[PDB]
Amino acid sequence: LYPLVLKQTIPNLSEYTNSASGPLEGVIRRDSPKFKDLVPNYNRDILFRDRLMSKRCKEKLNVLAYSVMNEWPGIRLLVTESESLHYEGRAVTIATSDRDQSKYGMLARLAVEAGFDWVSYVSRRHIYCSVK
Amino acid sequence: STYPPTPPNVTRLSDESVMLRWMVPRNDGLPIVIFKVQYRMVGKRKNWQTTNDNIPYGKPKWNSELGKSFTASVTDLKPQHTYRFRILAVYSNNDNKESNTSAKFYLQPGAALDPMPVPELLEIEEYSETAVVLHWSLASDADEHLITGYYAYYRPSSSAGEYFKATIEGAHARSFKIAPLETATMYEFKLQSFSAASASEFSALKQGRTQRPK
């Protein structure tokens, strides 16, 4: 299970395609009839730099949270942001609590393992993940 | 600390593929476990593409007084487009570091380019327990001024994996030691001549075994 490298994507294909996170949809606003569906994540072992996410997002973000702690006992997952799926709650921008950029490739792999539908090593600063 | 690969140098293999060559300079930083290969189109809306291969660092640590050099192909490229290429090293701590990018490389169609000489590959010299020596010839006609060197492709016999590649420079070479190889192991080998602009059809695929420990 190799870590991802800068700009690597698993699966190795486009985000909005089928085998990945599936299609885009409605941009969710405060007035939106959708707005009631975006759930908060009050997992205490996830650090937020925001708490409001889609349903599948939470499911996988929680497995990854405890997967990070699993891979590195004492470390915590950090969510830094919750035209892409961010306005829909279906995308996260993540790092680790100890800010170890050298772990990011590994974190990316852990987001895949944790069952995110599409992971993208977008920068040295942070990893992008999304769900269908 | 972690020392990056040099930017890859590119030669054209066919209308849809290229060979990349790079080095890791001698350094006391962390060991590299694998390299990943990335390319991107120069132009519209364009992102970095990662190929599926995980190129192993292999042994030994260094194959020269300067570092260790590597050869790898990128295939399934769209013809008649400009690309840039880079190499990413994965270190023993699972971090990664990318090379500087190559120069813009236009992928030529083959119509204007001259056929390269096909090497005639001779039986594999079963040199040692850990090495083999390839020998070949060039047809009488061959314009040797066209040739920069030869690319060798080899893998365990019957393996479904991608061929390992190695580069031998010099039109006048007619032999090449492939090493270190696994002991008592059947490999299959093919060879092509190359220049910057193209590369020959392949020699016959030849099988050869490293020696069995007595």
Swiss-Prot record, chain A:
Superkingdom of origin organism: Eukaryota
Residues at which Ca(2+) 1 binds: D50, T80, E81
Residues the record lists as binding Ca(2+) 2: E81
Post-translational modification summary for this protein: Cholesterylation is required for N-product targeting to lipid rafts and multimerization.
Location(s) in or outside the cell: Cell membrane
Membrane-spanning segments: none
Membrane-protein topology: Lipid-anchor
Role description: The dually lipidated hedgehog protein N-product is a morphogen which is essential for a variety of patterning events during development. Establishes the anterior-posterior axis of the embryonic segments and patterns the larval imaginal disks. Binds to the patched (ptc) receptor, which functions in association with smoothened (smo), to activate the transcription of target genes wingless (wg), decapentaplegic (dpp) and ptc. In the absence of hh, ptc represses the constitutive signaling activity of smo through fused (fu).
UniProt protein name: Protein hedgehog N-product
Organism of origin: Drosophila melanogaster
Source taxonomy: Eukaryota, Metazoa, Ecdysozoa, Arthropoda, Hexapoda
Gene that specifies this protein: hh
First-to-last residue of the parent protein present: 99 to 246 of 471
Curated annotation (Swiss-Prot), chain B:
UniProt-annotated location(s): Membrane
Fibronectin type-III domain span: 4-110, 118-213
Glycosylation sites per record: N9, N100
Inactivation phenotype: Patterning defects characteristic of Hh signaling loss in embryos and imaginal disks.
Domains: entry comment: The first Fibronectin type-III domain mediates a specific interaction with Hh protein, in vitro. The second Fibronectin type-III domain is additionally required for in vivo signaling activity.
UniProt record similarity statement: Belongs to the immunoglobulin superfamily. IHOG family.
Subunit relationships: Homodimer. Heterotetramer; 2 iHog chains bind 2 hh chains when facilitated by heparin, heparin is required to promote high-affinity interactions between hh and iHog.
Role, per record: Mediates response to the active Hedgehog (Hh) protein signal in embryos, functioning upstream or at the level of patched (ptc).
Protein's name in the database: Interference hedgehog
Organism: Drosophila melanogaster (Fruit fly)
Lineage per the UniProt record: Eukaryota, Metazoa, Ecdysozoa, Arthropoda, Hexapoda
